[PDB]
Design a protein around this ligand. Structure first.
Ligand SMILES: OCc1cnc(N2CCOCC2)s1
Ligand code: NA
Length: 330
């Protein structure tokens, strides 16, 4: 089997991407944030505290002929941005872009934090990190990918995120028309449950490439690129007037600037992030200070190759017995 689904930016900044997902019978279509940095499939639901729902589409298990309560199971998750959600669990049929899984754990939110309520465009998350991170208790559950894997033509999924444009998530096959050149594969550590890999270095603009190992995670659920403070300082020093702002909470730059590109290494290959991709626009409406898309990881404990980096590439998440990541230009 295979599936293929279009993923669409939620706003003009590419703050996140939503992908329609069919849940239940008859289908209930919810727009979920596919997150390679977490391992829970959770949704706004008929159980979510009513004052915490503001425009989201909800899953109603009582209207699905295939829903079953997963009796006694609960879940509770906290993300790197301080957001959280929790609830109970149903099993149901879940379809992504034609690929169907029966018996998928669908985590129904009873509570969500303010950042979820305030984002009317995201109806929940679909986690694509390793199932060791799944929060369901007392019986940990599998991700959609882990449940689909044995049925897939090839045990892979690919992320092809757009810059200010739709892109694609594919399951079970690698679309050789979707990238240029060849795919460079690199080793993955699953020790922390993430798609954790080591970049071979970086360059700023037209500058020399610096060979240095940078261990980080491929995380479709994080907007920005978070790297060590040394690397980030070296980038923003090439932008006149850029500075780290403790009042704003990261690097800002004059909106009049033209940003340099940023290159990261994948083995002997190079992925170039255009300067445009690193513009996250005014800090507040009408401001002439703009927010940078490359920020320090120093106050996180891990480097994160979020959407800023991933959308410059065609990315293969290879879930074979020995997992690997692949990157190609596009
Ligand atoms: O505001 C505290 C700062 C820390 N690092 C800064 N930058 C300035 C621009 O060139 C790179 C480094 S400003
Ligand atoms: Na922000």
């Amino acid at each position: 089997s295979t599936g293929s689904a279009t993923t669409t930016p939620i706003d003009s900044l590419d703050d996140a991407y939503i992908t329609p997902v069919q849940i239940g019978t008859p289908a209930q279509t919810l727009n979920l944030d596919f997150d390679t940095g977490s391992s829970d499939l959770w949704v706004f639901s008929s159980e979510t505290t009513a004052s915490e729902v503001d425009g989201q589409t909800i899953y109603t298990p009582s209207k699905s002929t295939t829903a079953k309560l997963l009796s006694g199971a609960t879940w509770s998750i906290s993300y790197g941005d301080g957001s959280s959600s929790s609830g109970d669990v149903y099993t149901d049929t879940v379809s992504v872009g034609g690929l169907t899984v029966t018996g998928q754990a669908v985590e129904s939110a009873k509570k969500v934090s303010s950042s979820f309520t305030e984002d009317s465009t995201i109806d929940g998350l679909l986690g694509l990190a390793f199932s060791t991170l799944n929060t369901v208790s007392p019986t940990q559950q599998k991700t959609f990918f882990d449940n689909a894997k044995a049925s897939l033509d090839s045990p892979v999924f690919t992320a092809d995120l757009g810059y200010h444009a739709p892109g694609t998530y594919n399951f079970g096959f690698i679309d050789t028309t979707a990238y240029t050149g060849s795919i460079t594969y690199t080793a993955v550590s699953t020790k922390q449950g993430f798609w954790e890999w080591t970049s071979t270095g970086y360059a700023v603009g037209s500058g020399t490439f610096k060979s240095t190992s940078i261990d980080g995670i491929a995380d479709t659920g994080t907007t920005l690129l978070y790297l060590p403070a040394t690397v980030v300082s070296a980038y923003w020093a090439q932008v006149s007037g850029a500075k780290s702002s403790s009042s704003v909470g990261g690097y800002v730059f004059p909106c009049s600037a033209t940003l340099p590109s940023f290159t990261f290494g994948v083995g002997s290959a190079r992925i170039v992030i255009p300067g445009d991709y690193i513009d996250f626009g005014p800090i507040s409406t009408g401001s002439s200070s703009c927010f940078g898309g490359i920020q320090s990881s120093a106050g996180i404990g891990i480097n994160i190759f979020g959407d800023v980096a991933l959308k410059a590439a065609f990315v293969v998440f290879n879930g074979a017995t020995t997992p690997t990541l692949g990157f190609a230009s596009k």
